[PDB]
Amino acid sequence: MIRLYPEQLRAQLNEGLRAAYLLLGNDPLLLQESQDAVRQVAAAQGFEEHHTFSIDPNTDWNAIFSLCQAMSLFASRQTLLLLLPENGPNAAINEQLLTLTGLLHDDLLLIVRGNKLSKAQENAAWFTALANRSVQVTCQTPEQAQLPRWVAARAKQLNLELDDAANQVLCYCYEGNLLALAQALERLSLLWPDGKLTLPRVEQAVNDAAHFTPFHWVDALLMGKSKRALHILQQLRLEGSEPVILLRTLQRELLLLVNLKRQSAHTPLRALFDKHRVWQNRRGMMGEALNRLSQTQLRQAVQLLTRTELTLKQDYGQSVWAELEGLSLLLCHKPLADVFIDG
Amino acid sequence: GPHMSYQVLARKWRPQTFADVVGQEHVLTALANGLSLGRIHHAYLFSGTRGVGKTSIARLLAKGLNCETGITATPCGVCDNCREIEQGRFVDLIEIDAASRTKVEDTRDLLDNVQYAPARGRFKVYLIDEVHMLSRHSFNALLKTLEEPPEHVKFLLATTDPQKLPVTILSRCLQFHLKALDVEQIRHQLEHILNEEHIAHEPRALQLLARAAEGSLRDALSLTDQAIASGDGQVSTQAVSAMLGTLDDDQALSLVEAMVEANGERVMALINEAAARGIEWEALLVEMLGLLHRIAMVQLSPAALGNDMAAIELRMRELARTIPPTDIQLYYQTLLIGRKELPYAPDRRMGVEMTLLRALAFH
Amino acid sequence: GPHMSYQVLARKWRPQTFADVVGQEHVLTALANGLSLGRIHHAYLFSGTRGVGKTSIARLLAKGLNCETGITATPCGVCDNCREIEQGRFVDLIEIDAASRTKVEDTRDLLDNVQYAPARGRFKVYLIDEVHMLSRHSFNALLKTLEEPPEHVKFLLATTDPQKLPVTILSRCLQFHLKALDVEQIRHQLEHILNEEHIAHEPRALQLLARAAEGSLRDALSLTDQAIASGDGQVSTQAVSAMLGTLDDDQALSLVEAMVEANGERVMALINEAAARGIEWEALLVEMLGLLHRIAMVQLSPAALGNDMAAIELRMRELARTIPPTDIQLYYQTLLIGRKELPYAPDRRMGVEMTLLRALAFHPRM
Amino acid sequence: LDDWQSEVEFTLPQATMKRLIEATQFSMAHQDVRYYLNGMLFETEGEELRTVATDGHRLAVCSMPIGQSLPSHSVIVPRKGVIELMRMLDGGDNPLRVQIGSNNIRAHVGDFIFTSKLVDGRFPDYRRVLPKNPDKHLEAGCDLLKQAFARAAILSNEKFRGVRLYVSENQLKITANNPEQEEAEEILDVTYSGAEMEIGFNVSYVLDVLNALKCENVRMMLTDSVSSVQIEDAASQSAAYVVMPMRL
Amino acid sequence: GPHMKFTVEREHLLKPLQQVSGPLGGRPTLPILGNLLLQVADGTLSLTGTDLEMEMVARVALVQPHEPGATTVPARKFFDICRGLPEGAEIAVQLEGERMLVRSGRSRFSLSTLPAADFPNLDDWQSEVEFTLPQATMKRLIEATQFSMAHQDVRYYLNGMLFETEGEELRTVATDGHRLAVCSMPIGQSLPSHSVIVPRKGVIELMRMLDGGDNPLRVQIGSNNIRAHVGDFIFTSKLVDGRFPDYRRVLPKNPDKHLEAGCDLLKQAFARAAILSNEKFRGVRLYVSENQLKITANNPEQEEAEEILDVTYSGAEMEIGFNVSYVLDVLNALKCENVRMMLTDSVSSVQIEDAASQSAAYVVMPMRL
DNA sequence: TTTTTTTATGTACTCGTAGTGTCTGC
DNA sequence: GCAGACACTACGAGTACATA
Ligand SMILES: Nc1ncnc2c1ncn2[C@@H]1O[C@H](COP(=O)(O)OP(=O)(O)O)[C@@H](O)[C@H]1O
Ligand SMILES: Nc1ncnc2c1ncn2[C@@H]1O[C@H](COP(=O)(O)OP(=O)(O)O)[C@@H](O)[C@H]1O
Ligand code: BEF
Ligand code: BEF
Ligand SMILES: [Mg+2]
Ligand SMILES: [Mg+2]
Numbered sequence A: 001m002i003r004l005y006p007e008q009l010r011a012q013l014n015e016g017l018r019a020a021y022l023l024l025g026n027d028p029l030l031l032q033e034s035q036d037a038v039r040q041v042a043a044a045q046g047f048e049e050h051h052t053f054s055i056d057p058n059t060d061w062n063a064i065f066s067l068c069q070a071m072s073l074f075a076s077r078q079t080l081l082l083l084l085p086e087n088g089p090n091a092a093i094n095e096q097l098l099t100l101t102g103l104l105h106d107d108l109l110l111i112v113r114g115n116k117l118s119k120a121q122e123n124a125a126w127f128t129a130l131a132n133r134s135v136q137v138t139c140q141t142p143e144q145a146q147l148p149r150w151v152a153a154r155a156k157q158l159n160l161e162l163d164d165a166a167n168q169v170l171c172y173c174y175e176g177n178l179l180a181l182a183q184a185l186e187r188l189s190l191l192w193p194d195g196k197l198t199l200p201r202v203e204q205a206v207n208d209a210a211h212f213t214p215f216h217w218v219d220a221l222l223m224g225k226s227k228r229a230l231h232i233l234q235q236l237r238l239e240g241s242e243p244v245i246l247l248r249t250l251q252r253e254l255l256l257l258v259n260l261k262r263q264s265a266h267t268p269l270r271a272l273f274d275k276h277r278v279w280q281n282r283r284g285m286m287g288e289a290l291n292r293l294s295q296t297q298l299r300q301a302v303q304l305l306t307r308t309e310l311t312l313k314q315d316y317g318q319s320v321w322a323e324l325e326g327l328s329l330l331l332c333h334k335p336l337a338d339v340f341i342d343g
Numbered sequence B: 001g002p003h004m005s006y007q008v009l010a011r012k013w014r015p016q017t018f019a020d021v022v023g024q025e026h027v028l029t030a031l032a033n034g035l036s037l038g039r040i041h042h043a044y045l046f047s048g049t050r051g052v053g054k055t056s057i058a059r060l061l062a063k064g065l066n067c068e069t070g071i072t073a074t075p076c077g078v079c080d081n082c083r084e085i086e087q088g089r090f091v092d093l094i095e096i097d098a099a100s101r102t103k104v105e106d107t108r109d110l111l112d113n114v115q116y117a118p119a120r121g122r123f124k125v126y127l128i129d130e131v132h133m134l135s136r137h138s139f140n141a142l143l144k145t146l147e148e149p150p151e152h153v154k155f156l157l158a159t160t161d162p163q164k165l166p167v168t169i170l171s172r173c174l175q176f177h178l179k180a181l182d183v184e185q186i187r188h189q190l191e192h193i194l195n196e197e198h199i200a201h202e203p204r205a206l207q208l209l210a211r212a213a214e215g216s217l218r219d220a221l222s223l224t225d226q227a228i229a230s231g232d233g234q235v236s237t238q239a240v241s242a243m244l245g246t247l248d249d250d251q252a253l254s255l256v257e258a259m260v261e262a263n264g265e266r267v268m269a270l271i272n273e274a275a276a277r278g279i280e281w282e283a284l285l286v287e288m289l290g291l292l293h294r295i296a297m298v299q300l301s302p303a304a305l306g307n308d309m310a311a312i313e314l315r316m317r318e319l320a321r322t323i324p325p326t327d328i329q330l331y332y333q334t335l336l337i338g339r340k341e342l343p344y345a346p347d348r349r350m351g352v353e354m355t356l357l358r359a360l361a362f363h
Numbered sequence C: 001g002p003h004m005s006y007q008v009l010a011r012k013w014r015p016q017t018f019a020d021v022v023g024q025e026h027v028l029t030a031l032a033n034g035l036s037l038g039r040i041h042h043a044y045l046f047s048g049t050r051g052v053g054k055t056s057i058a059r060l061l062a063k064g065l066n067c068e069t070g071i072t073a074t075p076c077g078v079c080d081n082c083r084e085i086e087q088g089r090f091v092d093l094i095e096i097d098a099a100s101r102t103k104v105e106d107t108r109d110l111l112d113n114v115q116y117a118p119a120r121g122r123f124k125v126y127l128i129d130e131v132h133m134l135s136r137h138s139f140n141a142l143l144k145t146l147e148e149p150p151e152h153v154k155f156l157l158a159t160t161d162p163q164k165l166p167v168t169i170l171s172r173c174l175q176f177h178l179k180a181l182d183v184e185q186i187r188h189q190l191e192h193i194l195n196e197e198h199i200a201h202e203p204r205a206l207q208l209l210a211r212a213a214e215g216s217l218r219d220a221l222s223l224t225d226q227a228i229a230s231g232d233g234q235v236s237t238q239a240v241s242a243m244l245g246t247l248d249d250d251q252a253l254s255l256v257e258a259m260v261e262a263n264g265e266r267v268m269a270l271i272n273e274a275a276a277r278g279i280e281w282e283a284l285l286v287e288m289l290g291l292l293h294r295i296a297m298v299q300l301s302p303a304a305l306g307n308d309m310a311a312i313e314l315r316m317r318e319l320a321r322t323i324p325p326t327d328i329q330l331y332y333q334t335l336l337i338g339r340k341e342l343p344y345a346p347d348r349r350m351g352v353e354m355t356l357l358r359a360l361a362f363h364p365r366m
Numbered sequence D: 001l002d003d004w005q006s007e008v009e010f011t012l013p014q015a016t017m018k019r020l021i022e023a024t025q026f027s028m029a030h031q032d033v034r035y036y037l038n039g040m041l042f043e044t045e046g047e048e049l050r051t052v053a054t055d056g057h058r059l060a061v062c063s064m065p066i067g068q069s070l071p072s073h074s075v076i077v078p079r080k081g082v083i084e085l086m087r088m089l090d091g092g093d094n095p096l097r098v099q100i101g102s103n104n105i106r107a108h109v110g111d112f113i114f115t116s117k118l119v120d121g122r123f124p125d126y127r128r129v130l131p132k133n134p135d136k137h138l139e140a141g142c143d144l145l146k147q148a149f150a151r152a153a154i155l156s157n158e159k160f161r162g163v164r165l166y167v168s169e170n171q172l173k174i175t176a177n178n179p180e181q182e183e184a185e186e187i188l189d190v191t192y193s194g195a196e197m198e199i200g201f202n203v204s205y206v207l208d209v210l211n212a213l214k215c216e217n218v219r220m221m222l223t224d225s226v227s228s229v230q231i232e233d234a235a236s237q238s239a240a241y242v243v244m245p246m247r248l
Numbered sequence E: 001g002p003h004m005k006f007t008v009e010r011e012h013l014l015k016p017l018q019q020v021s022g023p024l025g026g027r028p029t030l031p032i033l034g035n036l037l038l039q040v041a042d043g044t045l046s047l048t049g050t051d052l053e054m055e056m057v058a059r060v061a062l063v064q065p066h067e068p069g070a071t072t073v074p075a076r077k078f079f080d081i082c083r084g085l086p087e088g089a090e091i092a093v094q095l096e097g098e099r100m101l102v103r104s105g106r107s108r109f110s111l112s113t114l115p116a117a118d119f120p121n122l123d124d125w126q127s128e129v130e131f132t133l134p135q136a137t138m139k140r141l142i143e144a145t146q147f148s149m150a151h152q153d154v155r156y157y158l159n160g161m162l163f164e165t166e167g168e169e170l171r172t173v174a175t176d177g178h179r180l181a182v183c184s185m186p187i188g189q190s191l192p193s194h195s196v197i198v199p200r201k202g203v204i205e206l207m208r209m210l211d212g213g214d215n216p217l218r219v220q221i222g223s224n225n226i227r228a229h230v231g232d233f234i235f236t237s238k239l240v241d242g243r244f245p246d247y248r249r250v251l252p253k254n255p256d257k258h259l260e261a262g263c264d265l266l267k268q269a270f271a272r273a274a275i276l277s278n279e280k281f282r283g284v285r286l287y288v289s290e291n292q293l294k295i296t297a298n299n300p301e302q303e304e305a306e307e308i309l310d311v312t313y314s315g316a317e318m319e320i321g322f323n324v325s326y327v328l329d330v331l332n333a334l335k336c337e338n339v340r341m342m343l344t345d346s347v348s349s350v351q352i353e354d355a356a357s358q359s360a361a362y363v364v365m366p367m368r369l
Numbered sequence F: 001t002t003t004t005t006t007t008a009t010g011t012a013c014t015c016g017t018a019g020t021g022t023c024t025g026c
Numbered sequence G: 001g002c003a004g005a006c007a008c009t010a011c012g013a014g015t016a017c018a019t020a
């Protein structure tokens, strides 16, 4: 219930165990390595038998068998590692968890692992009853701007030297995909145990395998950088989200931006953003975005976008995903189109 | 007659040692440095594209982890267990074709042999090729085996589309990513292969084969088998010229370049190529329109795209700036009108012919 | 409980003999030549617009293939096999509602039992109707059976359009294109049917029903059955004219001349009057296009008017004299485009108003 | 649901209906395009309650005399109703009262009356399906033929369980093939005399027929390779079966 | 090349085929593993069936003329050929070229085979502990402690029996977790000490191959495998890695309380206690008083009935040993006439034996609420 | 820090479950 | 006998994918 960060969960792990542990937060790899650290700490301590249970609706609780009966040949305590569903559990499972805690033995440990829960799921009967002694901890992957420091810190922990150019190429190639980042770090360490990597082969042992959620796409398109936007779209290949999500995203911000430009003659852009708290990390990134445009520019953007909107859904076009390449690139160096398209 | 069955060059020239693997310096060197020392993760995931060496490299790890000498980055040459793995039969390596074994009623049984004693030689090691076809419950069984793997065993793993695996097993496995071969790598390897047995070869045929291989080495070997077949035991420029009808790609830019003037036989040759190739005429004209639109974009901006056709950044630019924007707009009007009316022409080839004739009618 | 249930004309008068079929002379001649001469084939697909007779031709061919007389060009009609096919009991004519039975599962099921000998008939005819709604897997499943079926099985395909089929199947059957039936054939067949059914009919009413069916026996015959409900026991000219919404009056050319002279008020008044009277709009624009065609034709070559055109020549020739040749084609194109967009308009009257205003926008000076 | 007219009453032990259905159930259509082909035809005659089932390629007709005057009436009952009716049969002592209607079939068993909806179609004339000439007739031991057919079928083709009879003078030769070519040959001594003949046909169907009747000595009748085979028991003529050949 | 000649009868061929093709069900990785190896050597037939884990080899005498050779036959097809043939009929077999032809006078089949060289065999080893145990004794050893196996467990070695030997006696450890079981029967001859893990399926096959005959079972245990011989039948099975720890520790060291009652009396009483009102949720609740066993009912459907049993009791009073399922497992396999139970502590486990015999000692740790 | 928002119809595959044939030492 | 094994086969659901 404490709702702390794993940098402190390590501290509570070093001290006396605070009964059941619940580590949450959507994690690429940090959840698994935190689980591994918990496993090794427990193995050093009493609890050694890690029984893996997948918490899911429509799946009966075989954990009661461990809960009601104690181990007989090697007790050695034991730990129940629970895997939560990606949407959270239901009331039946939440109350059966409380029943299990009622069946808890002194050598039993409860570990609940999952993603962020809903408020009712968070404040269920089991969590409420365990709020007296259990702990809660959450973590999330670093952002784009927070990546270089994290990568450098991990490199310094692993006793391998990095460089600014190497960090740049890593944060470009592996942006938010820490599993790939960790594998690349291990590969660069094992390839050359010299301990000096500046830019000799870091690209040779690093591919383009990273996640890219749509919110950053306009962040490039608002500068109108042709090569950068084209490279971002090429990076989006092989993890290709269906076009509808990207289309919804850019229609959202373009409707917001056209409303902003309509109201620009009225109350200034900052106090207008006061209504448009879309948390674009300052609401000022949109402020520098709106600096480079024109009303005719917005017309040329919206015509192509709305033509695509019927180009993929009215007749089910197959090039429409590649059309996202077409629409984003043409806006980069189009101050205003002299009609000739006006879709 | 029924003698001299030259089996495929894909199978005959299959690498036997790490020195016979073309390209992929990073994977080779990484595993070489990892084999001398004992830091071996219990599961090695290999991923790449069509026909590169993932399966070959996996055979090489089965060769290396199991030998009389021991765990060696260097090859073995000849020693019983690794000798046995040159052919199919081998006792402590079992190759589960995961495509044929997807259900748990099979893969649970196969993984249930992990707790048996290993056969002759240490490191009971099995190669589950094409892992992306395992069922969800099969992946759960694999995960339960990976979380508490027996120390005396390891097992490799391969795929082609790594995005289909669960994040748990991907995070657990020490994934190596195997890169697509570059054109020079494939060309030199094919040169070596042809020189090895008996077949004469000219260089242009080999550049053409490498270009048409699209990067996969197995693809290059299949095309060299076809080239040998068509060329009657000689891969000369003529058999690969017959292949040139398939590997000839750059066609949409040449017609755009020839539209702005009367080049004579260029338009006729290009339409003959398009008809004999039979590509989508609607897509052909859409590519025409896209090229013309980015040209108009460059007219109002001296470097509007830059990354467009880096190989044609010395000819496309001339028509990107020399041609008046009014002519570009008129050509766009002509091509748009042609596309709008294209399906209603007697034939789409006739329609694209008429679009070209209308474009050539004005200037 | 009438005779089975086909008190409706659409089912009662489906032909039972090649002699009883109307039109389709080329395909009937081809099938008769194939049957008698011995050149038989395992896969015929009949493609044509709706209500032309591809299902009927297919069933009649199935009769002719399994008549006890032998492989006869004209089915017996009285022999036991023909009677069984008429009843639908005949266990070798396997009709398929391919629009309903689309799953590739059922196609595979019906292909597994193709090797069996026919129960009673000579040939095991696989009559498939509405083939174009087979799922792509079903189309490709039919391939190796269509190409080389056993000696005793013959396929019949009856599709509304041929171009939706994969080019593989389209290249393994005889494509018999059922030519759409012209007005005279429809009129003669309808008159013969009504004389057999003993209900009085007027020739011009039958002409209306023929010209409104756009070449379809089923469509025209359904329209006649509709008129029988309206016109009590008889297909009378007045009743069918009111039901079909024909332009009996002369307001068509009146609003034509109002429209070409940019008289917006007059055009709107005529439209309001027509809507109040209860006009039909698609026929209005069809008449517009016809009158414009006649005006243009006599603008090029005089003395081209006939009957009603030759009577209203006093206005038509004056219009051809005053309207330039270039503007006639533009008016015609605008009117036909409006007719194209009539379905894509929430109100038909509003769609016609839109079309007329688009036409008047050519010369919107006043 | 209300009562019905055209309702003839039956009085028969459940064993009679069980024997009948078990005699003509394995040859009843299952999800076939011919909609009337599903279910069984129950036809009333002054002699018996005949029943007819067919897939178009297995025609099984059973005829158990009932001992009551029956007006001629032909009914088709769907697959579901037939299965349920067979499930409701047991005991063999209670008299089953079968009540036919225009659109429904009812049946009184013990103390409960159950009903089933009735397929709307016109079933084919089975008598014409039955061959019109039994010129080539042979008799053979039922269990011997069943065992021989099982032996031959164990190597038969999997998807198309197809074997081939070769009938010569007092001899039956069963030959079976399959993908991954395997040949099964078996010779039976039979009571046959006539023209030499070969006929290919499904073996699962014939094994099913022999399982259904299971008499002492069967006899089959047949003319030509294309001609269907009519199999019955040599003791009586109450049950007949028709199997349509493979190949052509 | 090779051409073997079978001349055999069904009654002497049906059972070996069953014993060699029982476990051969399912689809194996090598297609040859789905096949049954026929060897004709001297006047002997060797039928071999494998699953990469256990080999069944059946020996059949060939009194009638024969020809040596080796081939492999689809097991299911060959078994179905031999089955169903007339009783007492003679099967003759000739393997010509590629195909093997079987004949029974009026029947002939042609089956496709696979070369004998492709068939895998298990390499020879040294059998450390070889003994000729009485078949009935081995049957008792397996059955008295086989009901507790813990199949499908994470330990990946708890799934198999353990066999321990000392001098002229041996024991079988039923590694289960919350259950333990051991059985002390003698061998009659001195054997060295050896601990071996045997998989669950191997144990099932080894107990099935006993057939309840009189022929002593000759069992050889090596470093990585075990072999069993009964009559003309041989069974081979690999071993599981990992060593299960000591089992005597789980035994109650100081059983302060003892109970004793007739085996049938306890059987009926606990059968009722398990079927009357204690089915799913925990179940029985035990209260041991002087010559009294008070059983309380706990179940999801809330049928709560209390029953008192008269069992001879040495002690004052105790509670909270009520693990119904495992004590049922013990009771069904007790094979006793009078049963004596040792209880030391509620927290610890419970031992069960015969009142006058130690043929099977059971250890069950009760569950707490 | 919680934030918008495409379908119908069809085809496969794999995992439970459920119902049923068949038959084995019990 | 025979019930329980034991197999085997069919059906629904959940999921992944395709194409118009
Ligand atoms: N690194 C390599 N060295 C030599 N041959 C290779 C290499 N990679 C691919 N090949 C060729 O391609 C064929 C198939 O290779 P394979 O390793 O199966 O590709 P994949 O990664 O798609 O499974 C091999 O037989 C070999 O001829
Ligand atoms: N060629 C024809 N001769 C006679 N009647 C016809 C003809 N074509 C259509 N009909 C009439 O149309 C009705 C439906 O015909 P049908 O053959 O089902 O047309 P379709 O090809 O669209 O399925 C028939 O019942 C018949 O009255
Ligand atoms: F075998 Be590879 F993945 F094409
Ligand atoms: F086109 Be028809 F109405 F089948
Ligand atoms: Mg591969
Ligand atoms: Mg039709």
Ligand SMILES: [Zn+2]
Residues within 6 Å of the ligand: B063, B066, B067, B068, B069, B075, B076, B077, B078, B079, B081, B082, B083
């Ligand atoms: Zn080696």
